[PDB]
Curated annotation (Swiss-Prot):
Family of this protein: Belongs to the TRAFAC class translation factor GTPase superfamily. Classic translation factor GTPase family. EF-G/EF-2 subfamily.
Record GO terms (molecular function): GTP binding; GTPase activity; guanosine tetraphosphate binding; translation elongation factor activity
Protein name: Elongation factor G
GO cellular component, one term: cytosol
Whole sequence portion shown: 1 to 405 of 700
This protein's record includes keyword Nucleotide-binding: yes
tr-type G domain segment(s): 8-264
Any single GO BP term: ribosome disassembly
Length: 379
């Protein structure tokens, strides 16, 4: 059997937010747009979905949306590869934001932010951006400026393209048109675009010399540079909008593709070998199989669903593997992946992907399931 989506096109993401930021609505919109990704045009532990861009401008990407509400929150940081930090445009950075931010830094998790609720009374995008800097110590770089705020919120400006995004209300924002930046925003957009170009220029000596030399960096140069810096945990890119009003999540999904890491963009997972020496497993189908079980869900029709993240190699239905923590063998039977509106039966799971096994005999959350001939304990 063959791999259908290249590993570099996977995005394992978790959504982190305070209770009042609109996490449930943001997640529901992500699942809505990524469930109809081929029609887009110019409670599961993990849900499989697809995205090819608001304008079908990217090859198809596989997005795994991982539910991420001490050890549990830290395990989730190892299951996802990148995070989307959701903040309220009114409330901004809360005390609980400071705590989750620290777990994210501990596991060096690249992230972008989505400032939601731009249509609510008291919305102030740049105030939230400034709070990310002053309260969390983040080098927060806006990718956009909102068009209006509160009852006047109508869209967002993509600072790189210098175009306003006008989403179609009738089709729930499945389609949109790019418009000229409004005259009353031109000055602010120029200032904030220069801010993001400066951030891009810091990525390499070649780009810095071009920037200081008076030449304009291209959109491709800017995006590659910003991606490098996000992956290196140097900056957090900021998007905004309203999930409920169908204006913003779509552009944030483009940002997930453009700036968040693939399984191959983060360091190889570390573990302990049988002889007590440290080992590692690279994000490759050719490496020996290794995975971490991260959630056990009950189901009244088939029994326990053991959710696992594969870090290396491949596992097929029928394979017998080792639970290295328990020193017991397990044989995989039925494997499934949850989509937004249905469950899909699959026969194999490869490096960088997530799925759930049915009928495993004795697997605890935190257990490593790996190759018998190449044992390792990841957690
Ligand atoms: Cl309001």
């Amino acid at each position: 059997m063959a791999r259908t989506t290249p590993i570099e096109r996977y995005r394992n993401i978790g959504i982190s937010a305070h209770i009042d930021a609109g996490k449930t609505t943001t997640t529901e919109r992500i699942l809505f747009y990524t469930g109809v990704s081929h029609k887009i045009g110019e409670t599961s532990a993990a849900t499989t979905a697809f995205w090819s861009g608001m304008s079908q401008q990217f090859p198809q990407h596989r997005i795994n949306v991982i539910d991420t509400p001490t050890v549990e929150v830290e395990r989730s940081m190892r299951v996802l590869d990148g995070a989307v930090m959701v903040y309220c445009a009114v409330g901004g950075v809360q005390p609980q934001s400071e705590t989750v931010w620290r777990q994210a830094n501990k596991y060096e998790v690249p992230r972008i932010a989505f400032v939601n609720k731009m249509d609510r009374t008291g919305a102030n995008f740049l105030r939230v951006v400034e709070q990310l800097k002053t309260r969390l110590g983040a080098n927060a770089i806006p990718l956009q400026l909102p068009v209006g705020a509160e009852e006047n919120f109508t869209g967002v400006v993509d600072l790189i393209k210098m175009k306003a995004i006008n989403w179609n209300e009738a089709d729930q924002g499945m389609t949109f048109t790019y418009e000229e930046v409004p005259a009353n925003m031109q000055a602010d957009c120029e200032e904030w675009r220069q801010n993001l170009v400066e951030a891009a220029a810091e990525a390499s000596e070649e780009l810095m010399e071009k920037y200081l030399g008076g030449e304009d960096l291209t959109e491709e140069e800017i995006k590659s540079a910003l991606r490098q810096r996000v992956l290196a945990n140097e900056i957090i890119l900021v998007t905004c909008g309203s999930a409920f009003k169908n204006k913003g999540v779509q552009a944030m999904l483009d940002a997930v593709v453009e700036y968040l890491p693939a399984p191959t963009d983060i360091p190889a997972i570390k573990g302990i070998n049988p002889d007590e020496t440290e080992g590692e497993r690279h994000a490759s189908d050719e490496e020996p199989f290794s995975s971490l079980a991260f959630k056990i869900a009950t189901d009244p029709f088939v029994g326990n669903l053991t959710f696992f993240r594969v870090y290396s190699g491949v596992i097929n239905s029928g394979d017998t593997v080792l639970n290295s923590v328990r020193q017991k063998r397990e044989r995989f039977g039925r494997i499934v992946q949850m989509h937004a509106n249905k469950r899909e039966e699959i026969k194999e799971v490869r490096a960088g992907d997530i799925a759930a096994a049915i009928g495993l005999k004795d697997v605890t959350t935190g257990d490593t399931l790996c190759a018998i001939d190449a044992p390792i304990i990841l957690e």
